[PDB]
Every structure is written in C-alpha cells, then in structure tokens.
Amino acid sequence: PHKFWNTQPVVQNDDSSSEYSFGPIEIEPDSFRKEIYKLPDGFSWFDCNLWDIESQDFEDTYQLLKDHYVEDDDSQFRFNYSKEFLRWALCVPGQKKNWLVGVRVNETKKMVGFISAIPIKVRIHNCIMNTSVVNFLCVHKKLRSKRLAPVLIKEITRRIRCEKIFQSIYTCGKNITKPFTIGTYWHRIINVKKLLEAGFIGIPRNMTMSSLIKYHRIPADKRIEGFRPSVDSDAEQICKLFENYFMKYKDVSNETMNNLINYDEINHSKELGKQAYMKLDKIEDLQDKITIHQCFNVEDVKHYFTNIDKVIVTYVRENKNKEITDLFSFFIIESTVINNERFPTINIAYSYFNIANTCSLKELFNEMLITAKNNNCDAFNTLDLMQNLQVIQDSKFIIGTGRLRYYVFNWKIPQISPSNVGIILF
Ligand SMILES: CCCCCCCCCCCCCC(=O)SCCNC(=O)CCNC(=O)[C@H](O)C(C)(C)COP(=O)(O)OP(=O)(O)OC[C@H]1O[C@@H](n2cnc3c(N)ncnc32)[C@H](O)[C@@H]1OP(=O)(O)O
Numbered sequence: 001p002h003k004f005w006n007t008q009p010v011v012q013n014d015d016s017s018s019e020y021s022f023g024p025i026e027i028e029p030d031s032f033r034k035e036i037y038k039l040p041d042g043f044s045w046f047d048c049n050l051w052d053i054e055s056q057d058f059e060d061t062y063q064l065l066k067d068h069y070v071e072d073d074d075s076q077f078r079f080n081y082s083k084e085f086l087r088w089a090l091c092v093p094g095q096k097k098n099w100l101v102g103v104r105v106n107e108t109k110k111m112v113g114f115i116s117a118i119p120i121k122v123r124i125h126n127c128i129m130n131t132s133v134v135n136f137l138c139v140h141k142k143l144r145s146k147r148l149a150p151v152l153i154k155e156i157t158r159r160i161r162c163e164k165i166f167q168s169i170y171t172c173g174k175n176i177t178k179p180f181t182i183g184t185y186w187h188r189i190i191n192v193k194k195l196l197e198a199g200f201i202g203i204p205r206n207m208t209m210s211s212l213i214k215y216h217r218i219p220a221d222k223r224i225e226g227f228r229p230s231v232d233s234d235a236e237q238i239c240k241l242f243e244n245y246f247m248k249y250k251d252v253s254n255e256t257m258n259n260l261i262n263y264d265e266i267n268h269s270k271e272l273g274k275q276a277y278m279k280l281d282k283i284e285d286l287q288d289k290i291t292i293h294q295c296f297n298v299e300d301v302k303h304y305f306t307n308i309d310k311v312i313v314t315y316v317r318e319n320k321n322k323e324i325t326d327l328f329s330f331f332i333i334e335s336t337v338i339n340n341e342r343f344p345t346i347n348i349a350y351s352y353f354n355i356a357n358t359c360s361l362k363e364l365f366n367e368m369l370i371t372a373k374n375n376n377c378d379a380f381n382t383l384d385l386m387q388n389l390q391v392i393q394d395s396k397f398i399i400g401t402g403r404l405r406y407y408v409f410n411w412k413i414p415q416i417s418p419s420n421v422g423i424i425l426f
C-alpha cells in the first residue's frame, strides 16, 4: 500500500475504469502547492549547474550517480553515466535551469540527492502537449528508506508546474501505480569474453568460450550500402523523416494528426481542458499503431539525433537521389561491474529511434549492431517498443531480467502494448 502515490493524480493499480479513455486526470492550474518543500535540517536544494561540464556540481552529480544510481536486482552492475552523456540527456532544447534539482549537505557540501526533468513534446492520441520527463532520481545509499524520494518528487513536480506543465512521463523498473505499458529488456551479446569476465552471462555446460563466441557473432554475410553518420545539415530531412514515420503509424485520422488538440492552450481552464477527453470505441482501433510518442522539431533533431563519441550514434541511409530514407540511432552508457576491481566497466548500447523505409527493420538493426560493435559496445540493448519486436523475435537477443514500467502523471492512457509507445527515456 502506497502512502505517497495514492495521493497523486495517476491511475491507481486498483483502478476500475468503465471505458478506455484519454485525457487529463485533473485540471488544477491554480491549486497546487507553490511553496518549496522542506528538506531535513542541514540539507538544502540547489539548481544543479550542468551547463558547464567542468563545474563542481557536474562532478558531484557524476559521483552521486556513479555510486548510488540504478543497479540490477542482484547488485552486480551499476550505471556509470558519463558527464558527456548527462549533458546530452539533460541540457536539451528548452531546458530550465531549475529542472535540474540537487540536494546538498550544508556542513560538508556533499551532494546526496538528485532529480531531473527535461521538456519534451508528445502526442497522446488526439492531443499534443509540452510535457516533462522525470529521470535520474537518486538518493545517497546512506539516506535511503527515510522518505526523501517523495520530497524530491514533490519538489520537481512543483518546479514543473511553475512552468505551466501539469503532466509528466517517467519509467520505473518496478510496479508503483498502474503503468500504461510495460517494456521488456532484450540484450544482444557482442563482446562475449568481456561479458563473461563481468559475470553478465556464463558459459553453458554444453558449450565453450569459442562456441559461445561463434553463436553470438554479429553476422556480416549481408550488408546494406548507403549508411553514414548524420550531420547537422540533415536535421530538416531527419525531422521530416520522423513526421512521415509518425504519420505512417498514427492511431488517429489524417485530419486529426493535422489538427491535434494543443493541451498547452487549454490547461488553464477546467472548462476548456475538458476538450482533451476522448473515449475510444475499442482498444483494437489502436492495434499495431503508435498512440504516444515524442515529437521532434528541427532543433530537437539537431540535438538528439547527432553523433557524440561514446554517447550517441545516429546514422542515416541515402537513396540514389541523396535523400534520407532510413535512420538508426543508439546511445551508449557505461556500467560499473560492482564486484570487479580489475575489469571495472562495460560499454552498453541502447536502441533509440529507428526508421526503416527502404530496408527491413531487421536489416537496419543488423547494420546498427555492426556499428555498435565498431563503437566498442559490449552488448546491445533494446525494449520491445514501436516495431522492435519484429527484430527481437527472429534473432539472437536474450531476454533481460525484470520489466520497464511506463507511467504518465495526470493523464489517462489505456493499458497498451509497448509497440504503441514511441517514448525512449535515458
Ligand atoms: C506535473 C509534473 C509531475 C512530475 C512528477 C512525475 C513523477 C516522477 C516519479 C519519479 C520518477 C523516477 C524516474 C527515475 O529516475 S527511475 C530510477 C530511480 N532511481 C534509482 O533507482 C536509483 C537508486 N535508488 C535510489 O536512489 C532510491 O532508491 C530512490 C531515490 C529511487 C528511492 O529512494 P528510497 O528507496 O529511499 O525510497 P523513500 O523511502 O525515500 O520513498 C519511498 C517512496 O518513494 C516511491 N518511490 C521509490 N522509488 C521510486 C521511483 N523510482 N519512482 C517513483 N517512486 C518511487 C515509493 O513508491 C514510495 O512511495 P509510496 O509507495 O509509499 O507511495
């Protein structure tokens, strides 16, 4: 039983909903708490200066996450997000200085807590809105189980609402309230020996180090020409590539995609915001289509679908007209091998956004897998989001442990398949 999440505008696990509907859970533009939340005595909030990668805040944040952020259930691996990754993930177009939220010990200046939000644009069925993604919630291990997390969550919620934004998207590797979808982790082994040394996999009794290497090999027998890293001048072409992809998989009519309800212009009024509610005749009207996804304008594309060594890899395929027709992308996160003082980290690729128009998605992922290998990634990870299950099904991906639950704050979304979701969080 929750004591915090039961009070919040989210669909609860006990939820009995007559129908599949979309829309705001509450329209409360003026009634939220505006006063800063109290921390334990001796602690203080600060706006985390991630705007200069050399700053002390950035160093403190890197250290806090390195030692206290997400681990696997068995505490064998912990994420080790680089500063360059964090800068790409958090200093996004439109970001607010006050959406990077730190907790400091006044006596020692030690940073003991962090939470962040980034602005994104999203379509949800027939509505479009500016919203927030909350990520990198982190509390020092020595401060856990003291109910600080809700304080951090309440404070970031306040700071988002001060920007006239009343919804948020977030994921969790555990069930909290009722998730609108559940993603499954899949892993493609690239560097067998490194991952054996790290304990990520073992050597089966019916196999050898060498048979294992042969089995997990990325095939090269069939390559696809025309792929190159994206550059900044591709942004307009990439942007249109995404519009086309989302138009292709829309779950509303063409007239509706072109005339989405802009929740930003109506969320100040209980009466007008009602417009955003939508009943859905049948959940099968959504089958095989995308219902919620991020929207990118050209400045977003320039930032997200770029190439930064050891952070983000974006390739596009040109046709004979030198028009961009396909795109793959993946970001790179190192993980600490918690119990291995000698080989201490592994470099993992994570599928981001992928668009196949002139090749199959399987062919695209195969080109991306080779590129990830050539980027010194030890494994390639993906979720069964969008059309990825097509690649995962008939492949050498191995299932991960646990599941990734998707949440939206203060919005109703029926429970949907992850194929219907085009939201990737870092
Ligand atoms: C309008 C805008 C809205 C924006 C807000 C949108 C919501 C954003 C939501 C946050 C999005 C996070 C997105 C990411 O970054 S997911 C990554 C989360 N980070 C980690 O797992 C890092 C390692 N772990 C930690 O640092 C701590 O364990 C954390 C800080 C996670 C919990 O610290 P601690 O273990 O000491 O717990 P507590 O005693 O203080 O408090 C327990 C209460 O807090 C709820 N809880 C615990 N963990 C989570 C969690 N991961 N999401 C949501 N709620 C969580 C819990 O249900 C319980 O409440 P209730 O069950 O009694 O009700």
Ligand SMILES: O=C(Nc1nccs1)c1cccc2[nH]c(-c3ccccc3N3CCNCC3)nc12
Binding pocket: 070, 071, 072, 073, 077, 078, 171, 173, 184, 185, 186, 187, 200, 335, 346, 348, 350, 379, 381, 382, 383, 400, 404, 425, 426
């Ligand atoms: O250690 C871990 N993964 C390792 N893969 C190879 C060696 S170690 C790992 C540990 C905890 C949570 C994890 N979630 C995932 C993951 C897997 C596949 C697709 C997406 C994923 N996440 C990444 C973080 N944000 C949400 C989405 N991985 C991990």
